[PDB]
Design a protein around this nucleic acid. Structure first.
Ligand code: DGT
Ligand code: MN
Ligand code: MN
Ligand code: MN
Length: 430
DNA sequence: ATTATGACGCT
DNA sequence: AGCGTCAT
């Protein structure tokens, strides 16, 4: 009871840009705004592969991973924007630069953890204490939360969406103890006020809309973020967790959407996150290991301790290209030419990174996949990265992989290569 | 022939 | 260090 930790110490938000690459293209080209549209890589094979989809297009069933030709069968008026190609490969620079715009705005409110190109966690605990002491016990007006949903509300004893949002928010605010500066629910609420301000700043200063989740930890904030997209934010309180998890498929929780989640379902004979509460911590550890077991035991009760890392920049800078089917690289000239193309993009990005961020990478990781290998990476080898020179990097990568050539003929490459990947790692301040 | 990344855990 | 999993 009084010593049962409840995981309510922190206020954590997850901010995620709505259909990010689409918004980047819609900002640049107003003709794409408020339209079914998608962003594609390449074009020759089945119209290119879709990697981002506007919400208008999602209404037609268009999704990520779809080929554009198939998407056009669902949505004949779908508009398409193509990712830039440079040196023979997709080049994602426009979206990385747009991401930096957003991350820099978020960093004005709190230290952030860059979790992806379009999302960041925020630890708002200190900012919340600040704003609470500024409020002087003054209640929080619904006007300060104009895009906020309170998960689980309204409940208890009109048929529009905005109306239900306002009803739930009213019930939430009516329940609040705005005189207790240590009340977790109040702290979350103030956190949501701050996130409204952050999201308003992002849209004002970039044109981009985003969604967000506000809760007591990263997993709940991420889950919350997904509940009311697009262009809305959602507060998931500690108290909302039993009902929310009672019908939550295990796979919806970050890190459980793959083999581990499938094993939780199969071994324990359960379907929903809430069903995990009936197992002891030692039972879960016995099935899933010490770390996973302890994490599951806490997470199904709404408790997770993973910190928001102070890290706004990516830890690695990488360049990769698949060579599927009959485009696989089968000669030395071919392998060397593509290693050079990748290395030239890497050099350009690394040199910009060194100028912007006062650091240098010291390790080059070279990854390949050979034809017929089921795995995504067939071989991974490191070497020293001592100079930002593409010709040196591509020569070193070749030197590191050259013995994977089974061909006695040195001019040919067998088995042909179906992927090349160069990654710069182990940054040091400079 | 979902492609291009990027983080992190294991041993 | 190199490999595997998660993510999208
Ligand atoms: N190159 C590449 N980029 C991807 C891939 N999957 C996602 N992305 C990019 C494009 C997305 O706009 C961006 C952010 O992904 P999200 O999962 O946050 O989805 P998105 O923002 O598109 O929509 P959302 O509103 O968050 O559901 O990442 C991929 O498989 N390959
Ligand atoms: Mn997004
Ligand atoms: Mn995202
Ligand atoms: Mn997505």
């Amino acid at each position: 009871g009084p010593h049962m930790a409840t995981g309510q110490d922190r206020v954590v938000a997850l901010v995620d840009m709505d259909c990010f690459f689409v918004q980047v293209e819609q900002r640049q080209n107003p003709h794409l705004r408020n339209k079914p549209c998608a962003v594609v890589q390449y074009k020759s094979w089945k119209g290119g592969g879709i990697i981002a989809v506007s919400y208008e297009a999602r209404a037609f069933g268009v999704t990520r991973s779809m080929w554009a030709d198939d998407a056009k069968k669902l949505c004949p008026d779908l508009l398409l924007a193509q990712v830039r190609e440079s040196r023979g490969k997709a080049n994602l620079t426009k979206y990385r630069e747009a991401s930096v715009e957003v991350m820099e705005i978020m960093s004005r409110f709190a230290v952030i953890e860059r979790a992806s190109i379009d999302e960041a966690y925020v630890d708002l605990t200190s900012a919340v204490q600040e704003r609470l002491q500024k409020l002087q016990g003054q209640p929080i007006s619904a006007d300060l939360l104009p895009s906020t949903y309170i998960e689980g509300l309204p409940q208890g004893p009109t048929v529009q969406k905005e109306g239900m949002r306002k009803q739930g928010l009213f019930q939430w605010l009516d329940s609040l103890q705005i005189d207790n500066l240590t009340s977790p629910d109040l702290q979350l609420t103030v956190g949501a006020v701050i996130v409204e301000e952050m999201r308003a700043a992002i849209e004002r200063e970039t044109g981009f809309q985003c969604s967000a989740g506000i809760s007591h930890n990263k997993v709940l904030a991420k889950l919350a973020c997904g509940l009311n997209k697009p262009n809305r934010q959602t507060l998931v309180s500690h108290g909302s967790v039993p009902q929310l998890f009672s019908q939550m498929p295990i796979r919806k929780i970050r890190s459980l959407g793959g083999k581990l989640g499938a094993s939780v379902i199969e071994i324990l004979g359960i379907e929903y996150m809430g069903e995990l509460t009936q197992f002891t911590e030692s039972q879960l550890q016995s099935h899933f290991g010490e770390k996973n077991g302890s994490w599951l035991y806490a997470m199904c009760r709404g408790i997770e301790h993973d910190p928001v890392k102070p890290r706004q920049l990516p830890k690695t800078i990488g360049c990769s290209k698949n060579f599927p089917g009959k485009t696989a690289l089968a000669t030395r000239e071919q392998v060397q030419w593509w290693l050079l193309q990748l290395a030239q993009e890497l050099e350009e990005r690394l040199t910009k990174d060194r100028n912007d961020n006062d650091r240098v990478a010291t390790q080059l990781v070279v990854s390949i996949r050979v034809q017929g290998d089921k795995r995504l990476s067939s071989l991974r080898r490191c070497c020293a990265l001592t100079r930002y020179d593409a010709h040196k990097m591509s020569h070193d990568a070749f030197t590191v992989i050259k013995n994977c050539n089974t061909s006695g003929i040195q001019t040919e490459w067998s088995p042909p290569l179906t992927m090349l990947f160069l990654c710069a790692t182990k940054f040091s301040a400079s």
